[PDB]
């Protein structure tokens, strides 16, 4: 059971590097005890080896993560960026991907990961919802994301 709270959702200031985005989004998970204390270091080392950026169509998406051994409780942290931040395309691509929205996934089970990639593909495909994410505030994007994953969960079963 993944834990999604308002505290995990946040807006990030401009002129912020990818490293700082990782540490900032992992900070609430570390404080809650959802992950290990140095969870951000394993995420960025994973991020350098395997790019997690996805192009989509309205906005860009990032899916940072790490091995399941470091995660203690399943969680998800969402970050909204005021200006596009460079992220390398997942799967391998020379041209960079301008990622506006970042989805940090901490999952303790390897088999659950594929289902959460399918949830993410579903929500990011909606062109109007991705572009409305930017204008909505933290509480508005949290409730919309919560409602959509809850809707997606009842459709999965």
């Amino acid at each position, epitope marked *: 059971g993944i834990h999604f709270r308002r505290h995990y959702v946040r807006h990030l200031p401009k002129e912020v590097s990818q490293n700082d985005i990782i540490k900032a989004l992992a900070s609430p998970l570390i404080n809650d005890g959802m992950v290990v204390s140095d969870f951000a270091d394993h995420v960025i080392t994973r991020e350098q*080896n395997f790019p997690t950026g996805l192009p989509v169509e309205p906005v860009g998406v990032a899916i940072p993560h790490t091995d399941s051994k470091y995660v203690r409780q399943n969680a998800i942290s969402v970050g909204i960026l005021a200006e596009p931040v460079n992220f390398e395309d997942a*799967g391998g691509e020379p041209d960079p991907v301008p990622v506006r929205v970042v989805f940090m996934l901490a999952l303790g089970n390897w*088999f659950d*990961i*594929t*289902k959460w990639l399918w949830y993410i*593909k579903a929500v990011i495909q909606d062109e109007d919802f991705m572009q409305q994410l930017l204008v909505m505030n933290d509480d508005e994007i949290y409730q919309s994301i919560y409602t959509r994953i809850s809707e997606l969960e009842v459709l999965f079963q």
Partner: antibody
Amino acid sequence: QVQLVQSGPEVKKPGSSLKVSCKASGGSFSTYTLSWVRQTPGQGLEWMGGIIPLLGLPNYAPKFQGRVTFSADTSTNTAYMEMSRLRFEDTAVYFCAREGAGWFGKPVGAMGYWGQGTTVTVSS
Amino acid sequence: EIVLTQSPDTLSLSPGERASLSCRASQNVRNSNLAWYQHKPGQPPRLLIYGASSRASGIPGRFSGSGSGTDFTLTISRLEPEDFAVYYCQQYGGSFGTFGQGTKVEFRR
């Protein structure tokens, strides 16, 4: 439909290195897991592990963590299993299996689509 | 490690009869992450049922799955010549997946 085509039969000497390929002709398996199941002569199926192609995140069964390595290429839709220091015990038939998809492409978790299998013989 | 044991080892039945296959786990299978496969000589294993009871696409109405926790069952209401094969159960609730020993169903004469 979506199908998985594996490499041909291989006979290798003890202490050699093996590499098996599995291409998904049908569709991109980037979103779904790709697992490897072996079966030794007169025995049952055995789960070696799997790879998440888009993320590149592998999972190894504790029995195969040391000598087996999984990988996958998303541009050619082909997965690979490497095994160094082949043994007589490694003689088996090796299967690749893509994760099944439910209605509207929901990943079920089980291995829905299977390759035809590759016979691997280790002998002097 | 989650270990799976299947019973019986060999099930001897005639077409038209009802087949019951048992799969038991040492620990509770997480989220009922179990699957039933059918393996015939010279063919790749065919997925029959995923999860506790969910049926894979294309499988006839005969095959049905039941169970939760540590006990699980595969039931074939009606048997036909095609159904005679070896059947495996696999769990994917643990951190790594494991298979069962398998149960062979054979024609009885």
